[PDB]
Amino acid sequence: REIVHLQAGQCGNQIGAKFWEVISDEHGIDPTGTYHGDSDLQLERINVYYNEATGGKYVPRAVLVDLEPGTMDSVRSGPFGQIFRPDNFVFGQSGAGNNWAKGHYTEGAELVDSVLDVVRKEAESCDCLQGFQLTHSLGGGTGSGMGTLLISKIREEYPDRIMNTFSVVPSPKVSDTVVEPYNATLSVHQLVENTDETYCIDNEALYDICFRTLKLTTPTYGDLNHLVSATMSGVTTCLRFPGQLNADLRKLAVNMVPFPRLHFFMPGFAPLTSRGSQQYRALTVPELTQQMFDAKNMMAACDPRHGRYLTVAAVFRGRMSMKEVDEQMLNVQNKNSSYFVEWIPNNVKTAVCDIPPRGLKMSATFIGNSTAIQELFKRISEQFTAMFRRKAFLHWYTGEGMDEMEFTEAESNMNDLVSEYQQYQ
Amino acid sequence: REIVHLQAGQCGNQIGAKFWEVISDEHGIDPTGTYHGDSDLQLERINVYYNEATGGKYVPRAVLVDLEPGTMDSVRSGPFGQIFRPDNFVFGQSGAGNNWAKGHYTEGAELVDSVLDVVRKEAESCDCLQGFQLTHSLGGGTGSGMGTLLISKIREEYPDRIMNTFSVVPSPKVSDTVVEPYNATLSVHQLVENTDETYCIDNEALYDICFRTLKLTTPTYGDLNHLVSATMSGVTTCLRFPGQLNADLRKLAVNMVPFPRLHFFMPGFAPLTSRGSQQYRALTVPELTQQMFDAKNMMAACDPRHGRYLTVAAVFRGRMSMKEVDEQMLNVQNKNSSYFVEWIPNNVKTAVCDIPPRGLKMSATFIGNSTAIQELFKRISEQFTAMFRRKAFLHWYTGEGMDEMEFTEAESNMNDLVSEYQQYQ
Amino acid sequence: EKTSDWYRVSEDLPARFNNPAWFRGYRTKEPPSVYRTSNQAYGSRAPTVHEMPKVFYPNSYKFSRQVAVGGMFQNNTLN
Amino acid sequence: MRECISVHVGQAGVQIGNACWELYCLEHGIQPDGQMPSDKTIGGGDDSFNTFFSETGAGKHVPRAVFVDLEPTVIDEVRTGTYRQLFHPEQLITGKEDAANNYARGHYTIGKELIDLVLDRIRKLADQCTGLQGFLIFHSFGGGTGSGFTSLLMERLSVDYGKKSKLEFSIYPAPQVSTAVVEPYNSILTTHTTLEHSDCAFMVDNEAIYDICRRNLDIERPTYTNLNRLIGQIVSSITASLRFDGALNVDLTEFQTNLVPYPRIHFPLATYAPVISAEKAYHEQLSVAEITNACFEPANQMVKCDPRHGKYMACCLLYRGDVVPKDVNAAIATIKTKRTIQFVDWCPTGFKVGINYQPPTVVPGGDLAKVQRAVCMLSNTTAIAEAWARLDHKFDLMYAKRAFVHWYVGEGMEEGEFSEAREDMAALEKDYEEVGMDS
Amino acid sequence: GKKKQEAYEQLLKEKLMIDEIVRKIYEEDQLERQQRLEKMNTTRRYIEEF
Ligand SMILES: Nc1nc2c(ncn2[C@@H]2O[C@H](COP(=O)(O)OP(=O)(O)OP(=O)(O)O)[C@@H](O)[C@H]2O)c(=O)[nH]1
């Protein structure tokens, strides 16, 4: 089993970088390429996210892609930087002024041809290919746009591998770009098109998580990005470490996504305690379920207590008993009866790996398709509606080769989904 | 078995000046001519490319032809240029002028007799000669004009001996000689019925592979001569070293020339890294086979993706099994079979040699007969006829004994040459 | 360096098979070199005690050769 | 006495041979270069060398082989290698220029330069032998000297020794995996020799022995060495009776009249049985039963072809080692009891057997494990027309557009011959299909 | 086998025999460079004295 990682965009690339460290340490590769680790349960599956390099060296399977050249230098000049291969750092010249357009019809194009060539070598090399993977935002031509292109093109050359975009949905309060509403709407259509499990994360929630559970006094994008790194490291765990109830990326999808169109899920790490309560707490399978469901954790800003929980998953890591997991999972499915659709309740999917996260008796990740995501695709649609009506900052998107109908087809797809969700509440 | 080396022109002399460096880098000959004892399989077949001298010293069988002593003031003053024998240094007093007519008709006869005398004297000192070989320039006049005068002269008294040439072909994008399409369409008119095999060397192909792949900051003509000499030493490796499936220069042409007017080929050297990417790459067979199809490391500047391969041969140097040589090559037959001719499931020669060059555990070089040569030929014919229609640069040829019937017959079989590629596409 | 100590001897195999140290015509362990042809792997290492066949059943025509000379018994005699 | 000149023509042969003569020396005690490392003058009544090694007059035990190849590169490697002092300088004939993949440069132009020396050596190597059972030609059924010179020699070996025998262990142009592009051609024209001046062609395709190393053995990424040692053990098992003793031994003449039926269908197969690598053996019981059942198993045939597409005409089973006669008969029963393995309507008994006594020789530094049992099942099958089909089809995808045909015609071979060849195989093709039809 | 060795030292004896006279060519070639330069200057000093 193997999985490529196409970090496109700044949000994406910087997220990809931190993730590669949280994937290295766990496996044991050092900030160069040598295995200076411990057990064999750390090199028995370095074939998945990693490759091989003459002389006990391990290059990450990645196709770093972004326009503004600066991004790549930052990654290289970062920590685990030289690990990435030089001929996979495919970057561009002129940047895309946060225009979903430029990165899909203008700049992206010239590079997209090349990006797919580097991505080809990576995939063509390995025989099996569980699925691809992409890390992007949803509010700039780099990640939101160029990506949707590097997902469409990829899905049409490889239409059987599990795609998985850990996108960062646009935010409600903590905004940053005024063309963000547009950037996102014109994008969700392409994700709702062909993406197996688009895990949606929201800067807002991640922030609160760092201001109540991590009690951090000042969360810098470093920390905020680390939390998402844990989720990117807790879905592919059953693919690179032993387990008592294995569950790879594909399985998770089949036993999660109900109809082939609800592929927007929310994340959640488990033992995320402040440094002043790790002493007062007792990691026990139970205590790893309250800090697992409690709205706060869910990193998407869509309190599931509003809508219903379509299908819930829990890829618990660590060394726990499954009678305990199974029970402390049923207690939930039962007790909270409304949320889990009462008429057709989705017995939460549970999986248990053994190799835990470096320094943490037990751990777990959470994926829960919830009929509440609506209050996220919806807000981005009210923001589109407003600006679109009085054709707002459209003289830039139209001035790229895009027409106007495209925007209406976009708004249609989004509200089409909003109903496709409400029709299960 | 042996092959003599003969070169005419400035570009021929400059290429062979470092060709004799790279062929003595393998045999272990210092720039005087003595052996440096490294293996018995390093001089057991040195007869092929070297001649014995008065004990210890090994003289090359090289004859150097030009109309000026300018490029011969540097081939002798080079770091490895004292090795040549001075009676083979045949030069004229007056230069040509980058023209075919003055180099083939008026001052050709004053030097072709002296060159034909010394190439016969070396040929009579042989046990068994497989053939001759030439390096020259098509755009110029000393390498193209008198160079193809020696093509026609040698074929007269050596008909049954295989004779290949390594000629640089005129540039697609940026010209060097103002009258270079006149010289090529006269030279290509003569080499197509005489040479058993020929190799196209595009200068922008050398610049594309030096910028994108090997990544020299300031390329010079030394590194270009390194790459053309490596693939020219690599094709002929099985003559002088043992191998478990060998291929001399004569087995190549019977394998790649299906029609007597169809012998224009495409060379390439497989392992080419930068100073950074050397480390992040495991040097084995599957990484080398499917990478040769990648057009970025191709040495043609006219990709086969707008053409069709006809027959391709790769000779492999080093200790490798050919199970994975055949298994990865059939993997790059069935995955992309449209660009190959569909009536042959396996149109590939695979040849092996057990002696690799120094510094590389295994190496490879390939020769390709494709359709995209006609894209070079169609473009150079319209480049020729754009200035031939207006009688532009033509009186400099008619002043040296050149009428128009030979030019209208040089474009005639060039037009028959572009006609004999469309039906095989 | 003796096959009677390590294997079980067959008591009829020739004493050439008893110790393989006499096979002195093989290579003298010159590994690592780059210029080492894959065809030099033919008999690259000397056979040891762990190779020698357990039994050996040769076809002695010594009885056959001493009789097959000339012709067989023919009755040219006067009975 | 029972002797057999071993001819190796072409690089392919010289290589399979350099592998055959090590499994021939190490089988006996012949040292790398003759001089049998003797000691205690106690006699041993060998006489088992008189099947492949001829004693000179000073303990050099010289081989009765004749390596021959135009290109002087594969035959010079033997003339300066660990076996430099085994062959007589003359018995390793060489040339100067190769046949560069061309049946013409093998049976027309060059060839003639050596078909007089090679024959003379085979002659002077025939008058010193006291029982020339038959020659064991080893040629590539798909290359220059392989097909070119073999034609010349095989023809010049029936216009003289005629009444004799010529068993041929040829490499078969593989289905897909192919190195030579002028290969399809260089084969439909070499059937103009095997279908006439031969006796039994144990064709062995590279592709098959390029996967049996992956499934059975674990050797992934196998080279020619490995291939040669396996295509060098079959010849041993087939030529053991002529030396080592046992029970129901089988000479070459007899191994033919118990196999090849009508005077043409004589192209069998070959399947060594205990080919499991050491790692495995430890966990299995290679017994007469499994060794024989795992002989008629699709994924074990040395030529890429389904055995379940053709009735097996005859089957010569050559066992070696501890093979209690009873156990062999048992297997043959079970084999006919199975239904997947179908036989013909013109060979009730069909299968023939034979038990030598010597164990399998374990070439030092090898992949095949040290088993106390082994069975080489030469198998004649009507399905061989499958590996024959592909070739003819590919031939007609090229000779239909006069492809790579000048090079051959130039060296001497009127295009008329190519056609005369295509139909030659049409006959043998119809033949196999025909010999399958029943009253 | 010893005759092959003895023929090898004949070439090695002959190896230094050419290297003896190749030095003599360079030693001779340097002499005319001084012979030209001496004739360069003795014509100088006498061209100015006149
Ligand atoms: N199985 C096996 N086949 C081999 C081996 N060596 C060579 N071959 C076969 O030989 C073919 C290559 O052409 P050859 O028959 O060797 O050509 P050649 O004998 O050198 O004759 P010329 O090239 O004309 O001089 C390949 O298709 C292989 O099938 C080997 O070691 N094992």
Ligand SMILES: Nc1nc2c(ncn2[C@@H]2O[C@H](COP(=O)(O)OP(=O)(O)O)[C@@H](O)[C@H]2O)c(=O)[nH]1
């Ligand atoms: N959660 C999170 N958000 C980020 C990260 N890096 C950047 N962002 C935010 O994501 C938003 C989108 O940025 P992006 O679209 O990548 O900018 P662009 O590449 O120039 O178009 C910005 O407003 C950033 O504040 C990160 O590592 N984690």
Ligand SMILES: Nc1nc2c(ncn2[C@@H]2O[C@H](COP(=O)(O)OP(=O)(O)O)[C@@H](O)[C@H]2O)c(=O)[nH]1
């Ligand atoms: N690869 C390589 N090409 C060269 C070199 N010198 C000249 N050329 C090529 O030769 C072409 C011009 O040839 P020219 O000098 O007119 O040949 P001449 O008439 O025989 O002297 C140019 O397009 C150059 O690219 C060299 O050292 N290496």
Ligand SMILES: [Mg+2]
């Ligand atoms: Mg050959």
